Unconditional design. Structure first.
Ligand SMILES: *C(=O)[C@H]([C@@H](C)O)[C@@]1(C)CC(S[C@@H]2CN[C@H](C(=O)N(C)C)C2)=C(C(=O)O)N1
Length: 246
C-alpha cells in the first residue's frame, strides 16, 4: 500500500502561489474572524503602498465631503492617457471599474492635501501619512497599509460600518461590483504598483453569498513585469473555490 498525500485548502493555496514562483498572502475575514492563507503569511502584517486600492477611500472622502457626486461626468480634457479605454468622459463609478487614474487624481486635487490628510487620519487608514504630494501619495509613499488593515477596511465598507454616511458607502459599494451569478456577488479592486521595488499586487474586496453573508478578502503578492494582470484574479478565484466561499 502506497502513501497518499492529503491536500487541505491550506496546503493547496500555499502551493498556488509557489506554482507562480512568487510570494503572496490571502487574508479572509468573515464574522469578525480573520484567517491567513498563501505561501508568505508574514506579508499579512507588512505595510505596502495601497496603489489603486486607495481609489476606494478617495471616492468615499470625495463623496462625503461633496467634492463630487455619483452622476458627475469627469471630462477627458485631451491628454494622452495610459490606456485608450480611459480616453472618454466618465463617471466616478466608471473610473473605478476602469481604475482610471486621472479621474482619481482630479478628485484628489479637489479634496486638497489638508482635507485629505485630516480624513485619512480620521479613518486611521494604514500608517495614515500622506506627505506633501496630493496626487501620488498612495503610489510612491509615504502612505502604506497592511493586507490585514485592508481586509478590515473593506469588510467595514461591505457592512456600511465605516465612519461615513450610509448612502455614500452604499454608492461606493455599487462602484466595486465585479460579477453577479447564482445569487453570489463579488466586489473588489485590483492594484499594481510597478514603480516600487519589489512590485506589489493587490486584490481587495468581498463576496456576498446568497443568504447575505459577507466574506471579505485581501490578496497581496509580489508582482513581476512579465505576469499577466489576471494572475491576481486567477489566484483569488481558485482560492475562494478551494475555501468553499464560492
Ligand atoms: C493601480 O494600482 C494602478 C495605478 C497605480 O497605476 C493601475 C491603475 C494600473 C494597473 S496595471 C499596470 C499598468 N501597466 C502594467 C501592466 O498592465 N502590465 C501587464 C505590466 C501594470 C492596475 C491593475 O490593478 O491592474 N491598476
Amino acid at each position: 500500500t502506497p502513501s497518499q498525500i492529503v491536500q487541505g485548502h491550506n496546503q493547496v493555496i500555499h502551493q498556488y502561489f509557489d506554482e507562480k514562483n512568487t510570494s503572496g498572502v490571502l487574508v479572509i475575514q468573515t464574522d469578525k474572524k480573520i484567517n491567513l492563507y498563501g505561501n508568505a503569511l508574514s506579508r499579512a502584517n507588512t505595510e505596502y503602498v495601497p496603489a489603486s486600492t486607495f481609489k476606494m477611500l478617495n471616492a468615499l472622502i470625495g463623496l462625503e465631503n461633496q467634492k463630487t457626486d455619483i452622476n458627475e461626468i469627469f471630462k477627458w480634457k485631451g491628454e494622452k492617457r495610459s490606456f485608450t479605454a480611459w480616453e472618454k468622459d466618465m463617471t466616478l463609478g466608471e473610473a473605478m471599474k476602469l481604475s482610471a487614474v486621472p479621474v482619481y487624481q482630479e478628485l484628489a486635487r479637489r479634496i486638497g492635501l489638508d482635507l485629505m490628510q485630516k480624513e485619512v487620519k480620521r479613518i486611521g487608514f494604514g500608517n495614515a501619512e500622506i506627505g506633501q504630494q496630493v496626487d501620488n501619495f498612495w503610489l510612491v509613499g509615504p502612505l502604506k497599509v497592511t493586507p490585514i488593515q485592508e481586509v478590515e477596511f473593506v469588510s467595514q465598507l461591505a457592512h456600511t460600518q465605516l465612519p461615513f454616511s450610509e448612502k455614500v458607502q452604499a454608492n461606493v459599494k455599487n462602484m466595486l461590483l465585479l460579477e453577479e451569478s447564482n445569487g453570489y456577488k463579488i466586489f473588489g479592486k485590483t492594484g499594481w504598483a510597478m514603480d516600487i521595488k519589489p512590485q506589489v499586487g493587490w486584490l481587495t474586496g468581498w463576496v456576498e453569498q446568497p443568504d447575505g453573508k459577507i466574506v471579505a478578502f485581501a490578496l497581496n503578492m509580489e508582482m513581476r513585469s512579465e505576469m499577466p494582470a489576471s494572475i491576481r484574479n486567477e489566484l483569488l478565484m481558485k482560492s475562494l473555490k478551494q475555501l468553499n466561499i464560492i
